[PDB]
Amino acid sequence: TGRPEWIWLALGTALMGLGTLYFLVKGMGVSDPDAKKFYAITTLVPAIAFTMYLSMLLGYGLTMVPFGGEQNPIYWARYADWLFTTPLLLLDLALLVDADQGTILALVGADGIMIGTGLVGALTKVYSYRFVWWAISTAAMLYILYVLFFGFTSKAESMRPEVASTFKVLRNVTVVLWSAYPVVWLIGSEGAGIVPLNIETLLFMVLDVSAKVGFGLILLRSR
Amino acid sequence: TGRPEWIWLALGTALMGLGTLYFLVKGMGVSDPDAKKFYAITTLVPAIAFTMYLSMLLGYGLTMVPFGGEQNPIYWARYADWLFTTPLLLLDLALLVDADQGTILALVGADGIMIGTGLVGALTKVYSYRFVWWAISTAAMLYILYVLFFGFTSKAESMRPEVASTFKVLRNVTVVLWSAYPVVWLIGSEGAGIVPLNIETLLFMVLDVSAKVGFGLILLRSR
Amino acid sequence: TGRPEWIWLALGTALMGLGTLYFLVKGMGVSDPDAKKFYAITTLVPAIAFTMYLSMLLGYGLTMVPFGGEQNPIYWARYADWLFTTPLLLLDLALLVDADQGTILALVGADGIMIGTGLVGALTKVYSYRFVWWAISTAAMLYILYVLFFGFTSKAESMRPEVASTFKVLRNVTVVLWSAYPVVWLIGSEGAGIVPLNIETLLFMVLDVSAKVGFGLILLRSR
Ligand SMILES: *C\C=C(C)/C=C/C=C(C)/C=C/C1=C(C)CCCC1(C)C
Numbered sequence: 001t002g003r004p005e006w007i008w009l010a011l012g013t014a015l016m017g018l019g020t021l022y023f024l025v026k027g028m029g030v031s032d033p034d035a036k037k038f039y040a041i042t043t044l045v046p047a048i049a050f051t052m053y054l055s056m057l058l059g060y061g062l063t064m065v066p067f068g069g070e071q072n073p074i075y076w077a078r079y080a081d082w083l084f085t086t087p088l089l090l091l092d093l094a095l096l097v098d099a100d101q102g103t104i105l106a107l108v109g110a111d112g113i114m115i116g117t118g119l120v121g122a123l124t125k126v127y128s129y130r131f132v133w134w135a136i137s138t139a140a141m142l143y144i145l146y147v148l149f150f151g152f153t154s155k156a157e158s159m160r161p162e163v164a165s166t167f168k169v170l171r172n173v174t175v176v177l178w179s180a181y182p183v184v185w186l187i188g189s190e191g192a193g194i195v196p197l198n199i200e201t202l203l204f205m206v207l208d209v210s211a212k213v214g215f216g217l218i219l220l221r222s223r
Numbered sequence: 224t225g226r227p228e229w230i231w232l233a234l235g236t237a238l239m240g241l242g243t244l245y246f247l248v249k250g251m252g253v254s255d256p257d258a259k260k261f262y263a264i265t266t267l268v269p270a271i272a273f274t275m276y277l278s279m280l281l282g283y284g285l286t287m288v289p290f291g292g293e294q295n296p297i298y299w300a301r302y303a304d305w306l307f308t309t310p311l312l313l314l315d316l317a318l319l320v321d322a323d324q325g326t327i328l329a330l331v332g333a334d335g336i337m338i339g340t341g342l343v344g345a346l347t348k349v350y351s352y353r354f355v356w357w358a359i360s361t362a363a364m365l366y367i368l369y370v371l372f373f374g375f376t377s378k379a380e381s382m383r384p385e386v387a388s389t390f391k392v393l394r395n396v397t398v399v400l401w402s403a404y405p406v407v408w409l410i411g412s413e414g415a416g417i418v419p420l421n422i423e424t425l426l427f428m429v430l431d432v433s434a435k436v437g438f439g440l441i442l443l444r445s446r
Numbered sequence: 447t448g449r450p451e452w453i454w455l456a457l458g459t460a461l462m463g464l465g466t467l468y469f470l471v472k473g474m475g476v477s478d479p480d481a482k483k484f485y486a487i488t489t490l491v492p493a494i495a496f497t498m499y500l501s502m503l504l505g506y507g508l509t510m511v512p513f514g515g516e517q518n519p520i521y522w523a524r525y526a527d528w529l530f531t532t533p534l535l536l537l538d539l540a541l542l543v544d545a546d547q548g549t550i551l552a553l554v555g556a557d558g559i560m561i562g563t564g565l566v567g568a569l570t571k572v573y574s575y576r577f578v579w580w581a582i583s584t585a586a587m588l589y590i591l592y593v594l595f596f597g598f599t600s601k602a603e604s605m606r607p608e609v610a611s612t613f614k615v616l617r618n619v620t621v622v623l624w625s626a627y628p629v630v631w632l633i634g635s636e637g638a639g640i641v642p643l644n645i646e647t648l649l650f651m652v653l654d655v656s657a658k659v660g661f662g663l664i665l666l667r668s669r
Pocket residue numbers: 081082085086089114115118119134137138139141177178179181182185208211212
């Protein structure tokens with residue numbers, strides 16, 4: 001219990017676990033081949049995040065990185081969490097509009113370099129270089145959101161009216177949640193070191209719970 | 224040769240290698256698109272396990288973890304082995320019954336958290352927490368075997384009579400092999416520390432050879 | 447700037463980055479579902495390699511391995527680069543001939559053991575064992591090139607005349623680029639220690655740029 005941010009990690013663990021339970025219950029009795037696919041995706045994300053937060057809570061997913069003159073605690077498991085869940089979330093958005101195979105490859109490929117290079121920067125000791133990697137990651141993020149705002153919204157307007165507006169909603173939710181992460185990274189202890197780790201951990205917990213449970217609550221209650 | 228369990232690692236390496244050779248020979252001349260798919264899966268598993276056991280034999284795949292008052296040797300490569308092969312095995316069982324896409328995603332997703340969290344527990348230093356991760360892993364295992372016993376056996380009874388009984392057999396073999404692993408983990412040096420590492424290594428070698436060669440011998444000699 | 451081979455790492459970073467930019471520009475306006483698939487693949491490779499070389503340049507992707515009586519610098523990120531790009535390249539060659547699903551699984555599976563076991567050997571401290579892993583890796587390489595020379599060239603002669611000769615070309619380019627890697631490994635500081643790290647790094651940069659940009663230049667300018 002030596003880490004004062006642990007309460008957020010505890011809240012974070014608990015909400016992911018229950019989030020997993022809700023989707024698990026709701027998905028029972030679904031025989032429609034398509035919905036079964038969406039529920040398969042939409043349940044796996046909080047189950048992974050649960051194990052990650054529990055790792056973070058229990059302390060297994062964090063190491064010490066010397067930069068800025070300090071021994072900075074780095075929740076490397078938070079990055080492992082993102083690497084496993086953001087491509088699942090991307091599939092949930094692409095399958096919606098029935099994207100071609102190639103856009104899915106590039107979108108998930110864009111997504112891996114984003115999260116991989118942030119971790120690179122997150123473990124990077126030379127203070128200046130840390131932000132080189134932050135720039136590369138955020139450029140990747142821009143490719144993702146460009147594809148989902150000007151490539152998918154086109155595909156949405158030719159499909160069903162139920163999937164159109166349903167995508168419009170989740171597209172917008174995606175736009176504003178994803179873009180807050182690099183901001184919080186930049187002002188936190190991994191970047192400029194203004195916001196403290198404790199606050200930073202709180203900020204990442206609320207976003208993760210919103211992105212990993214709330215996103216599915218939207219989708220799984222859609223026609 | 225400092226490790227007395229090395230003989231099992233050596234036997235283990237040798238049987239995986241020959242297992243790989245048999246399936247490689249048997250698969251020559253197969254032009255049927257489907258069987259080619261099964262043989263692709265059914266050969267890759269022993270080839271990976273070979274490299275892992277050889278790593279374990281040669282010692283590259285093992286580290287020391289302090290718990291229970293000792294510096295416990297941990298064959299982390301055995302866990303790497305499982306993470307690469309159990310989802311291949313799962314595909315071999317799902318493709319059999321022609322499962323929908325979503326059940327395959329959830330089954331392999333269930334399977335990754337199982338093996339990932341066991342490794343987490345296997346490297347976990349705080350003795351009590353080790354079994355927290357064991358509980359999470361085994362819960363995942365139950366989801367897998369639930370899906371394969373009450374979801375696939377239904378899909379098996381509507382397909383071909385050759386694939387029905389052929390799945391019935393491999394379903395049962397899966398049920399009893401997979402469930403022995405968490406038991407052996409629990410009584411071995413990674414858990415309760417009753418069974419010695421040497422015995423433990425023997426137990427994991429016989430199960431791995433059965434699960435990775437024998438399983439394919441069943442499947443690859445089926446209509 | 448302590449590493450004299452850094453100039454090659456710098457050249458290497460710069461060419462990957464521009465390579466990424468060219469394919470990105472060229473792929474704009476492509477609405478054909480198939481070409482979009484090829485461009486998705488053909489752009490991701492230099493974007494990954496860019497980040498890897500930049501990691502190598504910036505130094506994040508290299509560690510020290512004691513063997514042969516020295517503390518050998520090991521660019522582990524160069525191996526991470528290959529593990530992410532060679533299966534993409536393999537898809538670019540298989541999708542060309544419209545290979546069945548099973549050959550793709552085995553080819554990419556062959557490809558992972560190749561790169562995984564080389565890294566194993568590359569980090570292996572006991573000098574003799576290093577070449578055990580080199581032998582296992584090269585055997586994998588032979589399986590890949592066997593499949594692409596006697597299995598795909600057959601599939602090429604029954605498809606379109608535009609894809610036939612286009613595959614003939616890229617098949618041959620693949621044959622001679624891939625096979626130079628284990629040679630350079632063998633004569634470099636990771637193996638026999640004749641060629642110096644500086645030269646070795648130069649050799650791997652020219653091959654990587656040829657394999658990761660030039661290969662796509664061929665393919666993306668084909669009918
Ligand atoms: C858990 C769910 C989601 C949507 C997680 C999203 C995370 C990101 C978009 C992370 C982005 C980063 C960028 C673009 C650059 C700074 C480092 C980050 C990895 C935080």
